[PDB]
Design a protein around this ligand. Sequence first.
Ligand SMILES: [Ag+]
Lengths: 1014, 101, 201, 100, 50
Amino acid sequence: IIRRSVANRFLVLMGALFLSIWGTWTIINTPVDALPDLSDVQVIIKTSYPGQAPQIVENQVTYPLTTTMLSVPGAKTVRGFSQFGDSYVYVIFEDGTDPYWARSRVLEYLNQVQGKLPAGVSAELGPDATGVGWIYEYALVDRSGKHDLADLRSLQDWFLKYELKTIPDVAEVASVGGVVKEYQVVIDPQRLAQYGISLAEVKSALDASNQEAGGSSIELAEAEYMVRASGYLQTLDDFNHIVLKASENGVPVYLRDVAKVQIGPEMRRGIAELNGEGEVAGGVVILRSGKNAREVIAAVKDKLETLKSSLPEGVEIVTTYDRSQLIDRAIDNLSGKLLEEFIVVAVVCALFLWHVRSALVAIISLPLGLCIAFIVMHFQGLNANIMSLGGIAIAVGAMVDAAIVMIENAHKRLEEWQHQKTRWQVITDASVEVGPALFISLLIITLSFIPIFTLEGQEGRLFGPLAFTKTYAMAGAALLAIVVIPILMGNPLNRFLIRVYHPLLLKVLHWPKTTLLVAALSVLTVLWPLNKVGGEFLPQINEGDLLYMPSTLPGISAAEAASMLQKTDKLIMSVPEVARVFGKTGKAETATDSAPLEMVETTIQLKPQEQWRPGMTMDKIIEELDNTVRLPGLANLWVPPIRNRIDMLSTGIKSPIGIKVSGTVLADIDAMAEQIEEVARTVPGVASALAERLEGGRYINVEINREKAARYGMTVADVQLFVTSAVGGAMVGETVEGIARYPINLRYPQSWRDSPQALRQLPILTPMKQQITLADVADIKVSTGPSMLKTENARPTSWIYIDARDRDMVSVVHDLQKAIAEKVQLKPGTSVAFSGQFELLERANHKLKLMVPMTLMIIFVLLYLAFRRVGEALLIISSVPFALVGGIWLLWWMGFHLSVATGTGFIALAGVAAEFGVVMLMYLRHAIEAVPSLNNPQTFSEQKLDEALYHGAVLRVRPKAMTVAVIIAGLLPILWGTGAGSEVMSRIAAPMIGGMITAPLLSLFIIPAAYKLM
Amino acid sequence: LVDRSGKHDLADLRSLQDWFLKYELKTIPDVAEVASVGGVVKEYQVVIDPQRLAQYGISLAEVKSALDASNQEAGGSSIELAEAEYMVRASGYLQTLDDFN
Amino acid sequence: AEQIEEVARTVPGVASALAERLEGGRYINVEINREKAARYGMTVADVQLFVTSAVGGAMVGETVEGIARYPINLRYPQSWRDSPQALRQLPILTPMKQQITLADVADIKVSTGPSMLKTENARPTSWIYIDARDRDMVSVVHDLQKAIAEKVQLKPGTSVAFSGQFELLERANHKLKLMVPMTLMIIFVLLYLAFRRVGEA
Amino acid sequence: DVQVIIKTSYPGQAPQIVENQVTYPLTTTMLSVPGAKTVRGFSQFGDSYVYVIFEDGTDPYWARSRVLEYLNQVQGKLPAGVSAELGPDATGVGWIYEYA
Amino acid sequence: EELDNTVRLPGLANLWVPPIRNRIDMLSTGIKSPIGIKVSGTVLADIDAM
Ligand SMILES: [Ag+]
């Protein structure tokens, strides 16, 4: 046992050095962010569909993607954002699944379908990254008015993209905003009516007139020759001279003679601004999921610096989101604090048994002891995000104790032989009478920690990292305790504490029952912060740069929304701390930004809090700010970066509930959405149901009269020709200019298309060379409709998010199914399903009451091991709840919130107080040999029981005093601040400490006082 | 699938199994596919009539040309009207037997 | 590829740079005159029809003979396609049932060009292999970046990168001086084991 | 090393043009696939060969499929027929026996 | 048996089998049989006359 480990003895130093050299290589090598990748497991499947409409972008394009994907393995959900001009469809399975499986599998059924969707409009398949995946994001700038918007985006686009994606672990690099060169032929309905050429003639001509072909080798003067055809439509000259009517031996109508070819701006879909000055186009860098955010960035900056030249003139590159930085303010946080943990331990070790040895050996031991913790992430993968790095800090605390035990019991058996090579063999023996209570106890605290960690859901994916990290920080300390033994080799206050202590031993004795009584007091007083809990649960954290994102009502135009951003972006520059701002509104040219145009985002660089305002907690910024922007129709949500991104795609329900309602047609799930909304108000559920908040958006219906098509002898389809190409500006043909190819657009001028009435008057010229007007072949009616559609499983479903805050309401949900079932109407073919973040909270509760009982079954098939008798075990167990009481109370003071952050402090707590209770239960149990050395047994008791105590009593206030000091000394530094987010490590330090003030104090009276009884 | 009354139609059934049943199951953990068998599937049938076709003068490459074309739906942009931007739509989904004839 | 070739000779690098050794190959350009297409009332595309199918012998349709299917080719005879001048004279017959000749709708110019293209990452790149045999020249490479950076011209949107079997030989040298020292750290934490004293080791 | 050959038989054409209308949607699409090592192209006359290679020693029947993701998507940005072949399964050592 | 006879129409060689079996072999293409000469080669006439 503790013998063979000391026979391997000489081996460990080499075992140890093996670990030093090794640890220092992989350490500086880890991945290292924060904010664990999840948003679960997903595969985005975009379909760029230039211009269309959400009833119809749904029908002819999303329908063969929602639908085919029911039929692929991983058949989890085929859940669809199918909007205007785009069709996004996300399939997600179960958490933690080897995605490059999850990828390909999906793929099987995407290929098959490119025939059930139209022409072009080919379906994109995700990237490779999450939403966390947007590392760095730059903007493009001009220092002179000599450079053009069009010139820029192309530059970002045909010169920048090539320059980055060539970068190890950058996946994709999506350009945002600006404007894209657009060759536009503007048909002119007068010149078109004189000369006699239909659209199916121009568009017929255009598709044809812009190619390049070759046809063989000519065997000339022996060096064989290849033959080539010219045709790349590149000179505006070559445009104007396309031929339409070809009057032989006379004039040919040229294109010039029916339309006016002008270079213009693509229909805009993602617009970007940058303070007052810049409406501009720049791009972002999405991280090829699973790779050190930091290093990618390096390779980028370095390539950018390299690149700082190849530009033209007047175009700096500004950085709007250097995710690198928030990685450093935090990494240094934990770089400093752990060296600071040393300054505190040096203090208190040095202060207690004067003239220390242990801290110096231990510090060298830890970075290596850490050099192991992350190779074991290496054995079964993880994330060095701060959650994990939350495992490393407690690690210190759980590592503090053990060096301490070897440190104190060697003080006993070093001073007894100084009252009297082999001085050494006698010191190891000391750590044998007490021994295992250190090694073992460590083990105890660790598995006692794992059962709360395994949880799955959205949140359980969110602790999964930390969870593991402790597991590995323990392995270190666990077998460290056992090997924090071999490594070491290579006054006045105690008196007053001891005197203050002999009256309570003569008073925990003076009264047996009283411990149970003062016990029912403190463990029930706890119930006042154990029910009021201050308020709120798991929120917060700190970005460096904030994301404005509002609640905008659906419809708004494209020029206003470009100014309404010029403006918003104008006044957010007001407050001085803000270093740069960036408002990209609409998609971001990546399948991650499924953002419409009324969705306005804005990255907000903030200057180091080193300067610029007296006070202003991040919450005073938000406030003042939140008011520095009070325009109408804007419900403004302000959020950090990662969060905005990560939830932005974790589709489903922030909400706790919602009645999904499926079944085959809009009328069913629309009228339904109505029929039920009322149920929420009467029933005992605080209510706010919204059948349809999406369906806002206004259309211009164009009902061709069928019959009215026949007479005119025009095929309905042919009409379309004049609704799509003629009016919107539907495009045909892409000009090609090497590497980069720009698009050619063909439609009636800026005007005839300029209003419903103007549109009733559209000038149409049928195949029977006759002149009409659209109004004449169709009823142009206005109308109101949807600006989106969600979709769970091919069919149409309306998932009505709902909540009754600050409760647990599994009860209300059960009552509703019975109630509907007794009097409500389901139309032809339809079904209802329920879901939210509730099913997730109820599944975990069900498995947590099975892992905490399972953590106690293994705890008690270990609470009894080293010492035999049950009474002791029950004693450590009535002993912890007091620790928890001192702890949890530390919370009400601050009026906290609790979480899975507190939910962990609680857990190293109950482990460590358990650890000090068992050693104090031990200083009173191995010694049936202390009992009889004094023994006067026969008439039982005496002043001898009293004196079988005050010896193990005075010994416990040297080890436990300076250990409960540092324990209370590390769980603090992180509390009163964190220039690098530590709402996390505070929220875990919270109840562990209160546990400490209360806990050591409880070590002294349980061992005497549950012992008396049992 | 079964009918307890002669009020329901074979065609009505298979579609029900097909456009309402399939959705209701494949949404089930480890059910792969759920294949419908037998019945009958609604089939819009134009029956060319070789006499009326011979009088009027329209070849098949004319009817079939016409049919492929006459059953769509297209849209072409947003109209910037009273500030709330508008989208424009084309009707054409071949749904009324009236629209067929 | 031209502008830089000279840098190799003066600098301390034994030199032989070849901007382009590939670009050998001779073409017969067929510049359709656009305008000259309209009058004749023929769509440029339609011209193509007579450059590709008519002349090379571009194929259409595959005959099928069970298991195996052979291909059907359609073009002007072995002759009319038989020489640049013969080709200036190609006989063309437009949609306006009129008779012309290619020369008449296009300038058939001869020309010289590439018989290949390499390509690193979508764009076009010219990777000019180079060497100064029988040395290790990590030193020469460093001096060149500084030198170009002080007086050379980069046109609109462009970048230069370096590579070879050198980066491979330099990465290994860097890891070999880390595995041979690591092989001795474990060797000496084993050179001393069985016998104790350092002098022996 | 580790490679995936991606041929495109293009009966007759020309390297300015066998590059433009056929190799361009294969060089280009493949920037956007994982294993984003290099999209390095021999694009000649009548053929367009494009080899993607990652890092040494990688389970290729991964390396295969991954590539594949973006080859399917593009058969519309290249012409008629001239469909794009995807390697074999062998190396260059792979030519064992050869008869006449 | 009784069943096998409750169904004696013409042209029907009736095979009666369990469910799984019917399914599992129904696709284990090849040969229930122990042997069979496969004969390949490029056209119907060869492998038909063969
Ligand atoms: Ag958003």
